[PDB]
Design an enzyme around this catalytic site. Structure first.
Site, mmCIF file in Angstrom:
data_model
loop_
_atom_site.group_PDB
_atom_site.id
_atom_site.type_symbol
_atom_site.label_atom_id
_atom_site.label_comp_id
_atom_site.label_asym_id
_atom_site.label_seq_id
_atom_site.Cartn_x
_atom_site.Cartn_y
_atom_site.Cartn_z
ATOM 1 N N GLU A 156 0.849 -1.153 0.057
ATOM 2 C CA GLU A 156 -0.078 0.020 0.036
ATOM 3 C C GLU A 156 0.941 1.201 -0.052
ATOM 4 O OE1 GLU A 156 0.069 -2.321 2.342
ATOM 5 O OE2 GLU A 156 0.087 -1.612 4.334
ATOM 6 N N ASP A 157 0.497 2.232 -1.005
ATOM 7 C CA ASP A 157 0.961 3.471 -1.033
ATOM 8 C C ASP A 157 2.433 3.699 -0.788
ATOM 9 O OD1 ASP A 157 0.918 3.390 1.872
ATOM 10 O OD2 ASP A 157 -0.515 4.915 1.873
ATOM 11 N N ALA A 158 3.598 2.571 -0.875
ATOM 12 C CA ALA A 158 5.122 2.865 -0.868
ATOM 13 C C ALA A 158 5.375 3.022 -2.352
ATOM 14 C CB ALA A 158 5.463 1.446 -0.301
ATOM 15 N N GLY A 213 3.378 8.375 0.957
ATOM 16 C CA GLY A 213 4.324 7.344 0.795
ATOM 17 C C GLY A 213 5.551 7.331 1.452
ATOM 18 N N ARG A 252 -8.949 5.125 -3.551
ATOM 19 C CA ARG A 252 -9.057 6.533 -3.484
ATOM 20 C C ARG A 252 -9.548 7.409 -4.631
ATOM 21 N NH1 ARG A 252 -3.903 4.514 -1.522
ATOM 22 N NH2 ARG A 252 -3.443 4.933 0.368
#
Ligand SMILES: [Zn+2]
Ligand SMILES: [Zn+2]
Ligand SMILES: [Zn+2]
Ligand SMILES: [Zn+2]
Lengths: 1114, 67, 48, 166, 45
Positions: free
Chosen positions: A733-735, A885, A917
């Site tokens: 997730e969102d790295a 991130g 999102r």
RNA sequence: GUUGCC
């Protein structure tokens, strides 16, 4: 260049911001204060008098701030940037002229100093007003600074635009279990804050007040106001042929209970039970104290003789209390924007100037008669020589009034704290976003989420996509882009003017037909009782369009009640709109072509009658129109520009009308914490902690907002190549994964700057502080701690430092508090050392070191530290649409994909964000992003429009790339193609704060607190973590019974206690000290927080008697 | 600040092409897109390095301590 | 109840009061001046 | 201060490992770890009034405050020597403040004190002589007139070239 | 040597110790240390 | 001790 009014109305929006900028509310109030508002205060506290020796008088003729009347030079002044690094206050003195009786005759004296006012930057009493970057280049201040902020004694601050509920009007309140009330708070401009309340206890209308000893019912207080016939009472409040007669008729017989029946007997019923504030004369008449008790009440209106206009003002207030009991639909809310009053800077520090200025000329009066109580000291004495002792009370009052944000008023006795803040110089727009924000009042409605919510009567008034979250989620709001705050004008001319337009007076009409007719309310009071308003109100606008009356007036005209409203009080919110008279607007593009030639600004449009301002009330009568292609023949007030609903700090979002609505608010909290540039003079200033960035870039897709505030000219963040795909598992997730190469080429090298300061203090016995240094050892001066001391003691500029290695050597005398022995015997060697050490986990440099002198003469030392760093993993990157991130991993260059031309993507996002999102704006940012630099032209992605998609795909496909931006790639690991395609190109990525090396923390065995011996909170206090109470609840469900004991006694707080057996309370090393035998002592161990309970609980008269068993032989 | 010495993405040099790009603007008034194609920035990632570079250094130097 | 020395009910109002040991009320020095800013609890016991 | 085995006298606070311990260089035995950081009535009334009077005239004369607190020490011990009784309170502080003006060697000359109380200069200097003998000020710097030049030029409304004129 | 310089006068003055805080050749009251001549070492990355 | 922010 064939112009039309269809799409070129936008080119007047910058004309509105050219002459009328972005700090409109902050400067235009302080400029109203210094010129006009000071003369109106000396004229209200003039002629101080002394009862002893009665022929002595000091009266003030005028007051000025700034230049003299003798020399008539502009000003003699320290520049502000020369002032903001010496911890002084940017001030210019206040000069008055005075005349008085010296003696034989009266004399007048000119240009007396009394105090030193601070002046906010870009106000017209500063040097920086109307400069053309040539004088300003000498004064090394940035041209792009917003201005409007105090720099009081060092750190720079600003007061906020605070607001409260609308004073001097009425509301209604509805409550179920308590009965229903309606508030009416009023404020006379001197020493009064009075609020009135009307309560319905068990079906009867009542009235209470905070100056009457108890409650007084309603039929009395209208017969005391003259209306006595007791049919007129019902005739005012109820009307005819309704249910209001059935509800109200209960109140009329309490007149028969008290047997009053006339206007004479009505008054003294109040004054029999008035609460007597003692005036210490108290010649109370038993007829005169009731007329004033019917005068200091509902301070909107005051009366001469007849009481009449005050009487029916109460009758209209008690009409709405029976309209609500009929049905609860008539309720109003106290968070509607029409019941809000923004009030701005200079008319809010004016209240603080009163309580200091009246405190000036009374202690100055108390110094006069202390001198004049002498027989010989009566003839040639002058009083002006003791004005300098009372002079600085104004100055030191004002300076702490801006430093510590709490204001001790007296005429209201009110304690508003938190009225100022320290402004954020972290980014550019962070220094402008805080300039336009609104702080509410916090009246302890934390359960009610009403004002936490956002009301629809807000479109264009103030911004809707900007609000912080967490501690305040709906109570911090921000102004819109096109926004002006009103101000008061006058009220007696329009009351004379409405009589001319065909209205009568209240003292002629009976209440038999005012409910049949309408009624004008001037600031909530009935004055005309007009009928046929649509002939009346349209003739009123046509005078305002021609500009005979001031333009900040609203003609709200509702029809749920039979009333119309007028407002002239000032301090309320409004925006302008263009007039649409009929099925054709008054746009008239031949006027709009003459604007771009430049001879008429925006100000001439409101002179001719093409634009007028609309507040929140006048929106309710109007029928405003979006676009010229949607005109109805019954349709007014076309929208001047539709994307003006977002403030100057939310405007940098590209295409905000496509993305999800919460994912704009999450960027407004983080745009204001973006590393970038600050100002043109940013390598000159010496401030506390600034982040600076090496190679910035202007963003690729601009907005019409950001070219108004010059965000592009000193931006924040780069625009790197983004290929959204999953890779190597490190982006779940969102790295986000970025190469080892491009950061080595200079991708986002940030730079950190830190202030440290000391003050060389002079003590009582005339001993200084010295900067000696450089002790030697073994043929060599430089010890490992002394490689950077310099010859002067100031550590020399240009070389690195580590842990240890002090850089300002400071020595203080040892006799700091001894009495001065008047001799010269032993002062040769008394300096104990106290240097300043550089801590920190990483070696830094020192950037520049300066020394100067403060206000009173003490030597200053200010050296500025500096370090830069490479963006390794852990740091917080952003995407300008609210996708945070942490940098997952840094991989080498050969492992990423690569296209047909060899482009390595810089930063890789996994695709697991866009469905949840719903951030479609990033997907539209990239299609307009790829097309712009291939065509070589920057592209306009605005709000509510912008560069369209269908003509943007054609320029991409004319070069050879894909029509949807989705190019193919190869794999850098294994060499062949990818089975799917990759969405590809450049996205604008700004770096953010919260880097990791100043959050890495570890404490093995460190400091303990002095009182309870636990580890100490605070990173700079060398930390130690709080294992909380539900974490004590989290362990206990595991059934564990050993590490719970060590982590709450052994690892943290272990302590050794010897305790007695009989009469069991504690004892010290070898005693019991209550049975002095010292025999029965049994050693145990308990936490220090358990010992300290067993002593302070013994300090009051309860005793924790301990009893002891042994473990064994169960 | 000043123009970066290399491209971020590929790795060629752009330090000789900044003031030459300006020289294609005061004389030979031309489209900015087709100008660098004459200068020779053929790739995609080199075009973004000089289109978006704010030249902040021509405002810092007027604040010099040496008059 | 009885059978303890303190069990009589006259001890439930003050006649003697104890002073707590000074580790409970530490004399903190704020280090803005060479005078020690003493906590709240001494001056309550001092004025009585 | 003295170690337990080798009896060293020097202790060096190591601060690199967030322990902030105490240990000597000689042998290496810690001394103490876990550091403990700390997170007449009319006699008092008659000087509290005298504090505000020194606070008064220092404001009007633009005195920097590090003389005012130093001048309070002169008045405090001259209170003990029974010098203040009988004499004028408004006089005795003016001579007391002027002593600390010349120990600091400021530009403030004496008659500026005499002006605002509208009295004679020779009265204020009379009690200045009768004080300075009694409490035995021996060392006292000379009033160098070189001080007064560079303070006169600011109020002398002269040209911009104010450094060449001094 | 090359001691303290002024803010805008840029005039090299070496103040003797415990004497003054101002500069010459200007009425200005801010002094900055001129940068040392000792060799300093850096990496190139 | 008091506020600001994540
Ligand atoms: Zn015992
Ligand atoms: Zn490239
Ligand atoms: Zn030892
Ligand atoms: Zn100079």
């Amino acid at each position: 260049d064939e112009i039309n009014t269809a799409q070129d109305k936008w080119h007047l929006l910058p004309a509105f911001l050219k002459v009328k900028g972005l700090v409109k509310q902050h400067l235009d109030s302080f400029n109203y204060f210094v010129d006009t508002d000071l003369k109106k205060i000396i004229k209200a506290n003039q002629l101080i008098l002394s009862d002893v020796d009665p022929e002595f008088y000091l009266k003030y003729v005028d007051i000025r701030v700034g230049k003299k009347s003798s020399s008539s030079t502009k000003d003699y002044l320290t520049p502000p940037h020369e002032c903001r690094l010496r911890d002084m206050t940017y001030s210019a003195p206040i000069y008055v002229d005075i005349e008085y009786t010296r003696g034989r005759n009266i004399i007048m004296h000119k240009d007396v100093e009394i105090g030193r006012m601070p002046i906010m930057l870009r106000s017209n009493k500063c040097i920086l007003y109307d400069a053309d970057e040539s004088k300003m280049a000498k004064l090394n201040e940035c041209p792009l600074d917003p201005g409007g902020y105090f720099i009081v004694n060092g750190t720079e601050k600003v007061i906020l635009v605070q607001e409260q509920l609308s004073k001097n009007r009425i509301i209604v309140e509805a409550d179920e279990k308590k009965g229903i009330v309606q508030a009416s708070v009023t404020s006379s401009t001197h020493e009064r804050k009075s609020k009135t309340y009307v309560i319905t206890k068990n079906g009867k209308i009542y009235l209470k007040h905070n100056s009457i000893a108890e409650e007084i019912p309603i039929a009395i207080v209208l017969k005391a106001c003259g209306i006595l016939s007791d049919l007129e009472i019902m005739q005012l409040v109820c009307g005819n042929d309704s249910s209001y007669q059935d509800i109200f008729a209960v109140n009329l017989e309490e007149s028969s209970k008290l047997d009053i029946y006339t206007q004479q007997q009505a008054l003294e019923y109040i004054g029999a039970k008035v609460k007597t504030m003692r005036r210490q004369k108290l010649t109370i008449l038993q007829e005169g104290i009731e007329a004033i008790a019917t005068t200091v009440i509902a301070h909107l209106t005051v009366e001469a003789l007849d009481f009449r206009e005050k009487a029916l003002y109460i009758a209209m207030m008690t009409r709405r209390v029976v309209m609500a009991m009929y049905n609860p639909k008539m309720i109003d809310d106290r968070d509607y924007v029409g019941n809000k009053r923004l009030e701005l800077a200079g008319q809010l520090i004016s209240l603080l100037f009163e309580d200091l200025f009246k405190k000036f000329n009374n202690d100055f009066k108390l110094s006069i008669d202390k001198v004049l109580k002498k027989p010989n000291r009566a003839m040639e004495y002058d009083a002006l020589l003791s004005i300098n002792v009372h002079s600085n009370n104004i100055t030191s009052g004002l300076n702490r009034a801006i430093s510590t944000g709490n204001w001790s008023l007296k005429r209201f006795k009110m304690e508003r704290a938190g009225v100022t803040h320290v402004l954020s110089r972290l980014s550019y727009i962070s220094a402008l976003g805080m300039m336009t924000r609104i702080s509410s009042q916090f009246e302890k409605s934390r359960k009610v989420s009403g004002p936490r919510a956002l009301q629809p009567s807000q479109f264009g008034m103030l911004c809707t996509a900007d609000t912080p979250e967490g501690e305040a989620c709906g109570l911090v709001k921000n102004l819109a882009l096109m926004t002006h705050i009103t101000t008061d004008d006058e009220e007696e001319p329009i009351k004379k003017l409405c009589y001319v337009l065909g209205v009568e007076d209240i003292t002629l009409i009976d209440s038999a037909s005012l409910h049949l007719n309408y009624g004008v309310y001037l600031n909530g009071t009935l004055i005309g009782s007009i009928r046929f308003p649509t002939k009346f109100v349209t003739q009123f606008r046509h005078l305002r369009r021609t500009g005979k009356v001031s333009e900040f007036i609203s003609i709200y005209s509702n029809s749920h009640q039979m009333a119309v409203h007028i407002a002239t009080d000032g301090g309320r919110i409004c925006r302008p709109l263009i007039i649409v008279s009929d099925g054709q607007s008054r746009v008239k593009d031949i006027h709009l072509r003459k604007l771009l030639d430049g001879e008429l600004d925006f100000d001439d449009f409101l002179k001719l009658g093409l634009v007028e301002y609309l507040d929140v009330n006048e929106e309710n009568d109007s029928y405003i129109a979006l676009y010229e292609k949607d005109i109805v023949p019954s349709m007014t007030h076309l929208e001047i520009e539709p994307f003006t609903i977002l403030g100057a700090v939310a405007g940098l979002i590209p295409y905000p009308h496509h993305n999800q609505s919460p994912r704009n608010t999450y960027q407004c909290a983080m745009g204001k914490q973006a590393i970038g540039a600050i100002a043109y003079n940013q390598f000159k200033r010496i401030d506390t902690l600034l982040y600076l960035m090496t190679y910035p870039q202007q963003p690729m897709v601009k907005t019409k907002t950001i070219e108004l505030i010059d965000y592009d000219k000193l931006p924040a963040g780069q625009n790197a190549t983004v290929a959204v795909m999953s890779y190597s598992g490190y982006d779940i997730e969102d790295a986000l994964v970025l190469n080892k190469s491009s950061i080595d080429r200079g991708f986002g090298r940030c730079e950190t700057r830190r202030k440290t300061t000391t003050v060389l203090k002079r003590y009582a016995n005339h001993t200084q502080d010295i900067i000696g240094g450089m002790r030697v050892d073994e043929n060599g001066d430089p010890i490992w701690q002394h490689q950077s001391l310099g010859p002067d003691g100031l550590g020399e500029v240009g070389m690195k430092v580590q842990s240890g290695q002090i850089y300002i050597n400071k020595s203080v005398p040892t006799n700091s508090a001894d009495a001065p022995n008047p001799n010269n015997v032993n002062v040769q060697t008394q300096y104990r050392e106290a240097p300043v050490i550089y801590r920190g986990p990483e070696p830094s440099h020192i950037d520049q070191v300066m020394m100067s002198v403060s206000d009173n003469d003490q030597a200053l030392i200010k050296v500025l530290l500096r370090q830069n760093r490479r963006p390794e993993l852990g740091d917080k990157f952003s995407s300008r649409h609210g996708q945070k991130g942490v940098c997952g991993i840094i991989v080498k260059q050969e492992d990423m994909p690569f296209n047909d031309q060899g482009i390595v993507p810089d930063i890789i996002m996994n695709p697991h964000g866009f469905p949840s999102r719903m951030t479609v704006g990033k997907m539209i940012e990239l299609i307009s992003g790829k097309a712009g630099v291939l065509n070589g032209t920057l592209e306009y992605g605005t709000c509510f429009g912008g560069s369209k998609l269908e003509d943007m795909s054609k320029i991409l496909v004319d070069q050879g790339f894909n029509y949807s931006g989705k190019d193919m790639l190869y794999s850098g690991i294994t060499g062949e193609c990818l089975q799917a395609y990759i969405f590809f190109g450049p996205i604008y990525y700004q770096k953010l704060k919260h880097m990791v090396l100043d959050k890495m923390h570890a404490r093995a065995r460190g400091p303990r607190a002095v009182l309870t011996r636990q580890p100490t909170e605070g990173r700079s206090r060398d930390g130690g973590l709080r294992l909380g109470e539900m974490e004590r609840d989290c362990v206990i469900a595991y059934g564990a019974s050993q590490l719970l004991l060590e982590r709450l006694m052994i690892s943290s707080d272990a302590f050794e206690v010897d305790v007695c057996d009989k009469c069991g309370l504690m004892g010290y090393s070898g005693w019991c000290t209550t049975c002095k035998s010292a025999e029965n002592i049994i050693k145990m161990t308990i936490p220090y927080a358990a010992k300290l309970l067993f002593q302070e609980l013994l300090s009051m008269n309860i005793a924790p008697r301990l009893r002891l068993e042994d473990i064994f032989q169960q | 600040m000043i123009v970066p010495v290399r491209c971020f993405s590929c790795g060629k040099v752009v330090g000789d092409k900044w003031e030459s790009y300006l020289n294609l603007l005061q004389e030979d008034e031309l489209d900015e897109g087709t100008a660098l194609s004459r200068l020779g920035l053929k790739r995609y990632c080199c075009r973004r390095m000089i289109l978006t570079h704010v030249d902040l250094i021509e405002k810092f130097l007027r604040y010099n301590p040496l008059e | 109840d009885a059978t303890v020395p303190s069990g009589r009910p006259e001890t439930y109002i003050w006649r003697y009061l104890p002073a707590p040991p000074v580790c409970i009320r530490p004399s903190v020095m704020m280090q803005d001046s060479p005078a020690s800013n003493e906590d709240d609890l001494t001056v309550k016991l001092t004025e009585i | 201060p003295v170690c337990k085995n080798c009896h060293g006298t020097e202790f060096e606070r190591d601060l690199s490992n967030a322990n902030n311990d105490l240990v000597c260089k000689a042998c290496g035995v810690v001394s103490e770890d876990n550091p403990i950081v700390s997170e007449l009535e009319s006699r008092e009334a008659t000087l509290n009034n005298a504090r505000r009077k020194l606070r008064a005239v220092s404001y009007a004369l633009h005195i920097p405050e590090y003389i005012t607190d130093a001048a309070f020490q002169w008045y405090k011990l001259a209170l003990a020597n029974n010098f203040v009784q009988g004499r004028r309170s408004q006089n005795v502080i003016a001579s007391c403040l002027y002593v600390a003006c010349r120990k600091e060697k400021t530009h403030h000359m004496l008659i500026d004190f005499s002006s605002r109380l509208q009295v004679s200069v020779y009265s204020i200097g009379a009690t200045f002589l009768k004080m300075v003998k009694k409490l035995h000020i021996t060392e006292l710097p000379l009033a160098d007139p070189s001080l007064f030049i560079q303070h006169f030029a600011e109020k002398l409304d002269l040209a911009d070239k104010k450094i060449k004129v001094v | 040597t090359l001691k303290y310089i002024c803010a805008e006068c840029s005039s090299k003055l070496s103040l003797s110790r415990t004497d003054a805080v101002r500069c010459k050749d200007c009425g200005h009251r801010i002094l900055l240390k001129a940068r040392t001549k000792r060799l300093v070492q850096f990496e190139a990355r």
